[PDB]
């Protein structure tokens, strides 16, 4: 497939079109041990870029890419509904939280799946409930143009590398600004502990967040994790201090020389540490289609 087209101008502002880290004049050095060769650290409530790294490079977002089908069913489906499980659910590769045959799953139990777990078999379901691959594919794309993200093009609901799979910083950066925006995605990535329903013989049990910084630094908001053999690390976060909502993305990063988890920690660190205002760009605001919500009782 054609690769897209490169904007004449760097979305958000000309400043983030250069390689390297780019921050305003005068700033702290940012930190050392980020091995991320793309990142991005924001405001989400301003939407201001505070800093980043090769900010629209084009890259493979591995399994942070599920903002999208996630988002894309909450905007769409009703919590509550009932979804059955499949085989085919089961048969995708990397991480599962249990979808199966002869399982009934609520779009509100999948979401919980599809990102306190990255389960790979919650996003086929949900794909399939958004009216199957190549549906979901139109919608979730479509998606991500509305939200500005004309560095995205997503082969896969759940992140598996597939041909023409792209993104960027700033992209993975307006998806999840705008997912945050939303009580019910901020409520999911918030939450530590899930009852997941089990099926048939097999029992629920309690589902654990596997994301580290919600444990582990103060005032996060929590986050998603990803990694490809094509993306490398991925890895966005957020936390709020004192009303200073900041998040973070890492695209192609390593293990080393600390966690994922931490150089996100310390990019939130050096987010906080710059003066508020600061601001080398701008996340674009979403379509607003996006941004409002489109909705017995007879004489008897
Ligand atoms: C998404 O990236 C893939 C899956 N979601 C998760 C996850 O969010 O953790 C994993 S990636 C997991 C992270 N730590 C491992 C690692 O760093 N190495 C093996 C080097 C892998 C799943 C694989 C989805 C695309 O399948």
């Given at each position: 497939?054609?690769?897209?087209?490169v904007?004449?101008?760097?979305?958000?502002?000309?400043?983030?079109?250069?390689?390297?880290?780019?921050?305003?004049?005068?700033?702290?050095?940012?930190?050392?041990?980020?091995?991320?060769?793309?990142?991005?650290?924001?405001?989400?409530?301003?939407?201001?870029?505070?800093?980043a790294?090769?900010?629209?490079?084009?890259?493979?977002?591995?399994?942070?890419?599920?903002?999208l089908?996630?988002?894309?069913?909450?905007?769409?489906?009703?919590?509550?509904?009932?979804?059955?499980?499949?085989?085919?659910?089961?048969?995708?590769?990397?991480?599962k939280?249990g979808?199966?045959?002869?399982?009934?799953?609520?779009?509100?139990?999948?979401?919980?799946?599809?990102?306190?777990?990255?389960?790979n078999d919650?996003?086929?379901?949900?794909?399939?409930?958004?009216?199957?691959?190549?549906?979901?594919?139109?919608?979730?794309?479509?998606?991500?143009?509305?939200?500005?993200?004309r560095?995205?093009?997503?082969?896969?609901?759940?992140?598996?590398?597939?041909?023409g799979?792209?993104?960027?910083?700033?992209?993975?950066?307006?998806?999840?600004?705008?997912a945050?925006?939303?009580?019910?995605?901020?409520?999911?990535?918030?939450?530590?502990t899930?009852?997941?329903?089990?099926?048939?013989?097999?029992?629920?049990?309690?589902?654990?967040?596997?994301?580290?910084?919600?444990?582990?630094?103060?005032?996060?908001?929590?986050?998603?994790?990803?990694?490809?053999?094509?993306?490398?690390?991925?890895?966005?976060?957020?936390?709020?201090?004192?009303?200073?909502?900041?998040?973070?993305?890492?695209?192609?990063?390593?293990?080393?020389?600390?966690?994922?988890?931490?150089?996100?920690?310390?990019?939130?660190?050096?987010?906080?540490?710059?003066?508020?205002?600061?601001?080398?760009?701008?996340l674009?605001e979403?379509?607003?289609?996006?941004?409002?919500?489109?909705r017995?009782?007879?004489?008897?």
């Open positions: 497939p054609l690769p897209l087209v904007p004449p101008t760097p979305v958000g502002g000309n400043a983030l079109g250069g390689c390297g880290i780019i921050t305003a004049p005068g700033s702290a050095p940012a930190p050392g041990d980020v091995s991320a060769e793309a990142w991005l650290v924001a405001d989400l409530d301003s939407g201001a870029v505070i800093a790294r090769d900010p629209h490079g084009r890259h493979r977002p591995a399994s942070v890419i599920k903002v089908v996630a988002m894309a069913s909450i905007n769409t489906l009703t919590l509550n509904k009932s979804v059955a499980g499949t085989a085919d659910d089961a048969a995708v590769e990397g991480t939280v979808v199966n045959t002869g399982g009934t799953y609520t779009v509100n139990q999948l979401l919980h799946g599809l990102l306190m777990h990255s389960g919650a996003a086929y379901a949900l794909a399939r409930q958004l009216g199957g691959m190549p549906a979901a594919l139109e919608k979730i794309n479509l998606l991500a143009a509305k939200l500005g993200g560095d995205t093009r997503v082969a896969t609901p759940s992140g598996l590398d597939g041909p799979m792209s993104t960027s910083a700033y992209d993975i950066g307006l998806f999840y600004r705008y945050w925006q939303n009580p019910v995605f901020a409520d999911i990535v918030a939450t530590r899930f009852d997941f329903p089990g099926h048939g013989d097999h029992p629920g049990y309690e589902l654990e967040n596997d994301n580290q910084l919600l444990y582990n630094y103060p005032g996060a908001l929590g986050g998603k994790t990803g990694y490809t053999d094509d993306a490398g690390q991925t890895f966005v976060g957020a936390a709020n201090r004192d009303g200073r909502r900041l998040m973070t993305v890492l695209l192609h990063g390593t293990r080393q020389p600390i966690p994922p988890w931490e150089q996100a920690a310390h990019l939130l660190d050096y987010g906080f540490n710059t003066p508020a205002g600061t601001q080398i760009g701008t674009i979403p379509d607003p289609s996006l941004m409002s919500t489109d017995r009782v007879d004489p008897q």
